[PDB]
Amino acid sequence: SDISFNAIPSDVRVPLTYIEFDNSNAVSGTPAPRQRVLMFGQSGSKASAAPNVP
Amino acid sequence: FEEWENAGLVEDFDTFKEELYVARNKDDKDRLDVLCGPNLINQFRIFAAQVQFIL
Amino acid sequence: ASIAGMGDLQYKYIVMPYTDEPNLNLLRTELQERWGPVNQADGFAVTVLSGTYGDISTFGVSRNDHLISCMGIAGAPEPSYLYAATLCAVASQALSIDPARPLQTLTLPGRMPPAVGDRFTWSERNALLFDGISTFNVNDGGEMQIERMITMYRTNKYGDSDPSYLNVNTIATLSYLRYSLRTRITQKFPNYKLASDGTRFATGQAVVTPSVIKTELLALFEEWENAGLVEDFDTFKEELYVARNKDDKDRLDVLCGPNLINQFRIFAAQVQFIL
Amino acid sequence: MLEETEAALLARVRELFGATLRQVEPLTGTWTNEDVHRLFLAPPSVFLAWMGCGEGRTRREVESRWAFFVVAELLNGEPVNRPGIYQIVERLIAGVNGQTFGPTTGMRLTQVRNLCDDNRINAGVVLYGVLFSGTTPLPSVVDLDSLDDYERHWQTWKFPDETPEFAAHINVNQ
Amino acid sequence: MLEETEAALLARVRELFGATLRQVEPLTGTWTNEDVHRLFLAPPSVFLAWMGCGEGRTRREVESRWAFFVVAELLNGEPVNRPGIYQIVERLIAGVNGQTFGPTTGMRLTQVRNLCDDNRINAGVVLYGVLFSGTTPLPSVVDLDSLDDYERHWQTWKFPDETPEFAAHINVNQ
Amino acid sequence: AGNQRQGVAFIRVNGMELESMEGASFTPSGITREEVTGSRVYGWKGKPRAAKVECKIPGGGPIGLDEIIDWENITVEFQADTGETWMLANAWQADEPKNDGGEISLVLMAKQSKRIA
Amino acid sequence: AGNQRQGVAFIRVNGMELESMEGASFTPSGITREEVTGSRVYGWKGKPRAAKVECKIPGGGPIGLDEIIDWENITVEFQADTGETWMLANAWQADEPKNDGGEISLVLMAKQSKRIA
Amino acid sequence: AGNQRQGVAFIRVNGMELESMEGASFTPSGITREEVTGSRVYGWKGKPRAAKVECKIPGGGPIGLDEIIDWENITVEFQADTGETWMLANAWQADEPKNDGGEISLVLMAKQSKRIA
Amino acid sequence: AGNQRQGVAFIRVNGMELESMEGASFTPSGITREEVTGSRVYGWKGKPRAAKVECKIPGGGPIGLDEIIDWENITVEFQADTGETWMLANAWQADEPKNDGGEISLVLMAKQSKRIA
Amino acid sequence: AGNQRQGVAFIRVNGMELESMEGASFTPSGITREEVTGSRVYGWKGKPRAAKVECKIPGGGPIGLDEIIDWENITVEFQADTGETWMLANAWQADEPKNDGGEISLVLMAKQSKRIA
């Protein structure tokens, strides 16, 4: 679940190669216990994140 | 089991060793009862990729 | 609410753009509660303040915390929080690679420097460094680079000057040493039994003597020195002292002093030409 | 420990033969010329004696030495059951050699001696001596329960007195 | 020095058992057949004897040899407390082996002997012999305080008599 | 002590004192000096040396052999019975470990040893 | 056990326990670390190792010598009397087997041994 | 590691790790600098170089010799035991392969190698 | 076999197995790839190769030396002890045959070898 | 010192002391004198020479091989253990660097070396 996949079902059984193109440049979700940082910032309207929740 | 693993059929050894159990039968007196569990190796079927072009 | 809902994880670096007294007081309280020997979840905060030189100097003099570092900038085309985020990212990466290497020439990518007439002179930068405000520099091109990162700590408890807790490298090194000592103690001695020095326990038993902890601390100090964090060994060995507690009977008290290594900052030269 | 080894050897001897031997008892001393007269011999019987020790491989262990004294009765110049005596000796050798009894490790058969001389034969007693040797480790002078655990390790980093302290209160366990 | 070693061994034995042993006293000679009659035996008890010495590794040290004689009482053919005797022997071996007493270094257990024969058994005495050996260094014939310090070193360089002298008055210390 | 000489030595790894046999060796880390001769005798020449600790451990003890053969970064302490102590840091187990009749030989080695206490 | 040390060792091949003499060796399979010095001491360097079991068998026993000299793919089990056990799989008989005065030396060797039980 | 030096090297072709002998060579691809002197010493001069990997493989292994002599476009990976890795892409088998007493020499060569990981 | 490596090799000429010494060579017939550099590294270039088999035969054996020096059209079979086999057809005896202290060197050569079986 | 001879040498590049093996060479930059004979012996003749420093570095060390193969303008310092020091400025890495079994050979070369200190 480290890589968030779009339009690729999680239950696929056909043995082949699945290749997708996505414009956004995501960052690998490798855990870094010694490099955890926190940021404080304001969120404008049309936000989908609950306030005061990391 | 070591021979099987070297042949490329089973993967995990420590779990197999910990789940092994060999005992005699208390009724037959000539039959040995063993309960083992192997971890059959997986196959490479699905290769999911995501390409993030920059242009 | 946000500071109450952070959780219990160890956030080593914190980005706070709000430079106001009511918020910074709560942040300082939480950080100094985490910095104590009880919580042991070390944390650091990086802020950037935008304003005139006098306002920056006044703010730096006003704040006297050893867990917050602020960088002053005047006439910045970009908002302050962008600079704060970039500086925190660069500092976090550099200190995670090595806690003792100074932050002297690292550049901030994508941050536009102020105008030529809005940059601080040498005297202003020196006064800001003496006032607990970090300073930056402009590369030969259009790049903006870190100059020196220091904390807000300026004054001793009684009111005198104090050079301790000044460089961010000091805090980073102290945190790394505490983490390494905790890991070594919890790994080499998972669960043992305590006995007084001089008792005859003999082979086989899993007991620990203050001499054992002495030797383990000496070995860990050797590893620290080889890693490039501490310099003097004989003084550290002579100042070590390990003893049991006469009341708890299950607590071992140790008092050690390390000699944090120095950094190469100033290169003073004098040229005597003959012509 | 020696008492555990002696008890284990006695129990093994008792379970090896059971009703064949009349008694299996420990012995004081190795054997003397007056033992045939001062002892309650009930042939067949087996006596166990501890013939001191020796220098071990470490300073925490010693090489103990034991001996078995099988006693049999001869009547009119002939043993009562010669095959029985031979079987008893062979089974005693084969039931102790190589096994571990208590803390003792790997009993080694040193030699078997024939102790039938004028003193024993004139009393109608057939005696054989089977000698073993094992590895008995010494105990510890101080028990664990007397001393308590190492749970907390508190360290304070040296700094000027009027500065914010840096310390670590580490719980060694959990 | 031998007196210091003997005192240290006696003190260690006394503190090891305390009230369990009735007495802990030194012994003259190793052991004789009349010792069971001429001695004030109070079983259980421990006797310490110095069984001479040997050639050491240097000319300033010798390899001393010591022995412990635990005494126990047997009543009606049986020891009073056999586990007690075994525990006493094991603790004596484990409390002296490897430790240093006075100037002596690293006591080594040579062997343990069973001394229960007709002479001792007929008197109702159980005797075991535990023998050690250590490193006792010899003292010095001349003490330091008899001779005085070397403080001044005056040197005169040879020259013709009627010339300005060259000399050095050196204070060795300070 | 006043006249006490070294009779036995104790070796402790990560705080656990090892059940060592008699005759334990110890080679300090320093400079090994050689001999130089041409037409005459000229002097010496140096060569680096590494600290070594050698001993024997009985089999079947509290410390298993698999633990012994897996020591890469350990702390070794060599202490004489008189009071002389040497500390070896970041040591490792060298050579081939063998269990010959209940005897396990340890060749614990380190790149630098200093005399503490 | 509580204080029990290893006094004897048992070797079993394909389930048959071997009549082994005193002093049976065992070398675990792992990495042999060497020593590196140039102008100073720098560290160690690894080298693979193979498991070995050595013992002696009296002549005229239940297991013939022709069987011994024909072991190419066997299972060897090395167990100490205290309870430590090592398993060698797909082992083979190495070196030259000789019958010297009723003594047959076995150099049973394998490429990997793991400590079971 | 902290003090670990290179003792062994692993070579992998198309994912199959090769059974390599001791003493495996590796020449990185770069510029070879020569020496220039006329009336004085002036400087150096460059010359292109190609990556090379050399090793030996025992005969009768899983990988046949016919496969070895037919490698024109393969991927070669040279990894040290400490963790240093080099990747060779579109490599080929150069020189004459010979089976001398069960020894097969590989001269796997490529026109460019970069240090990955 | 499962783990068996090549230890010995057998050479058979016209069905007669040769009494070969230790260290028998074998060079398969194929393409030898060279190295091409100009201002940079460009690639490789091919060159044909011929199969070669080399060994040594003791003197005074069943096969005479006159027979050896007269082999123009023979069949040579190179087989490893593990099971790898190569066949050389229409081979010939090359180079100078010499009987040096009971040693006769054979340089049996052919223009093409294929791996049968 | 008074009688101390050179036993080891230290090589430092840009301040980093190199992990050098035994037997490090050093050729000073100067004039190489040849020999001239016609009908008789007449004298010598000069030829310029370039400074050279040669050593070996274990693989997997702090300094990577890619860094080694990319040295064009560096400062090399050759110091003997007795105290003799030579400085090479604007040096470069010459010849072919190879990693042969964990051994990397350096042929650091410069056009002029002067004896400082």
Author numbering:
A (entry chain c): 2 to 55
B (entry chain b): 441 to 495
C (entry chain c): 221 to 495
D (entry chain 2), E (entry chain 3): 1 to 174
F (entry chain H), G (entry chain G), H (entry chain B), I (entry chain A), J (entry chain C): 2 to 118
From the article:
Myophage Mu is a representative of contractile nanomachines with a simple tail baseplate. It has the capacity to infect a range of intestinal bacteria and has extensive applications in genetic engineering research. Using cryo-EM, we resolved the three-dimensional (3D) structures of the G(+) type phage Mu in both its extended state and urea-induced contracted state, the latter lacking the baseplate, at near-atomic resolutions. The structure of extended Mu can be divided into four distinct regions: the DNA-containing head, the connector complex, the tail, and the baseplate.
By employing the symmetry mismatch reconstruction and the local reconstruction methods, the structures of the portal-adaptor and the terminator-tail region of extended Mu were resolved to resolutions of 3.4 Å and 3.5 Å, respectively. The tail of Mu is comprised of 30 stacked hexameric tail protein rings, with the inner ring consisting of tube protein gp40 and the outer ring comprising sheath protein gp39. The tail tube protein gp40 adopts a conserved β-sandwich structural fold, exhibiting topological identity to that observed in myophages and CISs. Six copies of gp40 oligomerize to form a continuous 24-stranded β-barrel hexamer, with a β-hairpin of each gp40 protruding toward the adjacent ring to mediate the inter-ring interaction, which results in the formation of an extended helix tube structure with a helical rise of ~35 Å and a twist of ~25°. In addition, the inner surface of the tube exhibits a remarkably negative charge, which facilitates the passage of the DNA along the tube lumen. The tail sheath protein gp39 can be divided into five domains: N-arm, domain I, domain II, domain III, and C-arm. Domain I is responsible for the formation of the sheath inner wall, where an α-helix of the domain I in one tail sheath protein gp39 forms intermolecular contact with one inner tail tube protein gp40. Notably, the N-arm of one gp39 monomer and the C-arm of the adjacent monomer from the same sheath ring, together with a two-stranded β-sheet of the domain I from the adjacent sheath ring, form a “handshake” interaction by four-stranded β-sheet across two sheath rings, with the exception of the first and last layers of sheath ring. The domain I of the first layer of the sheath ring is linked to the BW1 gp46 (described below), and the domain I of the last layer interacts with the C-terminal β-hairpin domain of gp37 via the formation of an interlaced four-stranded β-sheet.
